[PDB]
């Protein structure tokens, strides 16, 4: 028994197109270095036959391989080449403002997952210009495991083409898929007492009080668009299935950014956006709630006493 070099190599683009439109790879790698081209074949002396992909055995990853074993044979020192074409599928995360995504497998790409070929101004591209491609209505073999498999036509597909691999993802619409705010909770009957420099939204049910600067946020901030409609429908949902109709809507729905960085939708009854993050422990608001309550109550008594 002697050595065992094993190197991991990106297919050529014509082959990428074959792979994902036929669920099969060619049994030969060829790369030119310096002058001549070099070439490897699967089992020795083989031809350039096609080879279909089949499933591996498993993590979050999903692999498809064209050969499930390793091989060799017995006068002088001989060196067999085992050729394996392998398509693997990893989840990649990427967080705002999406100037790069990364896989659990150590790939890091400095392109926006939403760099629709057109919108580099409203997005980011920052990998090798040489190697990046995009193909509108692009066919895909929809399941590499089975070879009969139907065909999907993906809207927009990118290919990055790195040294150890070629990376592909389906280009989506930002704003359509990403929303930067999430419904925390709703407080029916909240009390907006005004103060020196701040409103105090005291909620008994969620045992806490929130303070906002006195200038509410423009409702037409683009930031709010992804929950804008939900928030009103969340509001109207209450004033409909909460109290009777002796109460009635005072003033329009107004939105406030609170210190700490929540965002509050307000709708009264009767008878321009900090890039900040949300604060994690909400005691600071239960604290404000405590003070607000005792102080409110103390003044009430001591007044009616005096």
């Amino acid at each position: 028994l002697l050595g065992s070099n094993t190197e991991y190599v990106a297919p050529p683009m014509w082959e990428i197109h074959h792979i994902n439109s036929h669920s099969q790879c060619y049994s030969s790698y060829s790369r030119v270095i310096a002058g001549t081209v070099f070439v490897a074949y699967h089992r020795d002396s083989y031809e350039n036959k096609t080879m279909q992909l089949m499933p591996d055995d498993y993590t979050h990853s999903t692999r498809y391989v064209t050969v499930k074993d390793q091989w060799h044979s017995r006068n002088l020192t001989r060196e067999t080449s085992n050729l394996n074409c392998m398509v693997t599928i990893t989840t990649a995360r990427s967080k705002y403002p999406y100037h790069f995504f990364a896989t659990s497998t150590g790939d890091v790409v400095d392109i926006s997952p939403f760099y629709n070929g057109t919108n580099r101004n409203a997005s980011y591209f920052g990998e090798n210009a040489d190697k990046f491609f995009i193909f509108p209505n692009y066919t895909i073999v929809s399941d590499f495991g089975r070879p009969n498999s139907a065909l999907e036509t993906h809207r927009l597909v990118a290919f990055l083409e790195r040294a150890d691999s070629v990376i592909s993802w389906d280009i989506q619409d930002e704003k359509n898929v990403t929303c930067q705010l999430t419904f925390w909770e709703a407080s029916e009957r909240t009390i907006r007492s005004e103060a020196e420099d701040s409103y105090h939204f005291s909620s008994a049910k969620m045992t806490a009080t929130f303070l906002s600067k006195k200038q509410e946020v423009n409702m037409s901030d683009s930031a709010l668009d992804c929950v804008r409609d939900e928030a009103i429908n969340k509001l109207q949902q209450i004033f409909n299935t909460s109290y009777n109709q002796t109460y009635e809507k005072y003033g329009n729905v107004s939105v406030f950014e609170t210190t700490g960085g929540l965002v509050v939708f307000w709708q009264g009854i009767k008878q321009h956006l900090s890039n900040m993050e949300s604060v994690h422990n909400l005691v600071y608001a239960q604290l404000q709630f405590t003070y607000d309550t005792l102080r409110g109550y103390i003044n009430r008594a001591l007044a009616q006493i005096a």
Partner: antibody, heavy 113, light 104 residues
């Protein structure tokens, strides 16, 4: 956002060399470059394509200029220039987008021979 | 490349423009059109044939076959008065056509 301005001489005696340098407030060229070329237009005439260069030394000229043109690039100060050895308004437009073609334009001042 | 230096239409007419080159250019590549208001720099109007950048309405159109292209500005109005230029990649570089003044 992308940004392209232009400086350079505005009075050239015949047969003498002209130098035009286009500054970008991208502000970088990268291996993520695509193309950056020159485009000239005689006032009252149509548009004419001049030269074109990548972050590598290689470049593409129009033989209409019989390669009288010769462009240069300094990534250091984030600029690319041009050398010529016929009077018009000039421009520097680029490629900043897969698909498309020529997008993002920079006003390039007027020069007269 | 080739373009007729003018064109005409009353407000609401489907005006068209041809774009003539050889088989070296428009045959095996992609056409781009540009709405240059006089005194400014050209805005891409149509990219890689028929496709419209964000902003350009459905009124403008694309069309290509053989070694000549087209640009159909239906629903023609006033502000559409500008200088439209077509152009693609020949086998070695970038070229423009003559140009056309739209007058309504």
């Amino acid at each position: 956002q992308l940004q392209l301005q232009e400086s350079g001489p505005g009075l050239v005696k015949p047969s003498e060399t002209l130098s035009l340098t286009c500054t970008v407030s991208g502000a970088s060229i990268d291996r993520s470059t695509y193309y950056w070329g020159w485009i000239r237009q005689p006032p009252g005439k149509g548009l004419e394509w001049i030269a074109n260069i990548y972050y590598n030394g290689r470049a593409v000229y129009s033989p209409s200029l019989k390669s009288r043109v010769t462009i240069s690039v300094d990534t250091s100060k984030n600029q690319f220039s041009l050398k010529v050895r016929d009077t018009a308004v000039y421009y520097c437009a680029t490629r900043w987008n897969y698909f498309f073609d020529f997008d993002y334009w920079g006003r390039g001042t007027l020069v007269t021979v | 490349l080739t373009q007729p230096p003018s064109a005409s239409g009353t407000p609401g007419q489907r005006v068209t423009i041809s774009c003539s080159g050889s088989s070296s250019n428009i045959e095996t590549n992609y056409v781009s059109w540009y709405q240059q208001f006089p005194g400014t720099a050209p805005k891409l109007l149509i990219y890689r044939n028929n496709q419209r950048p964000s902003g350009v309405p459905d009124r403008f159109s694309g069309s290509k076959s053989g070694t000549s292209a087209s640009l159909a500005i239906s629903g023609l109005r006033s502000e559409d008065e500008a200088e439209y230029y077509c152009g693609t990649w020949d086998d070695n570089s970038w070229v423009f056509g003559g140009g056309t003044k739209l007058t309504v």
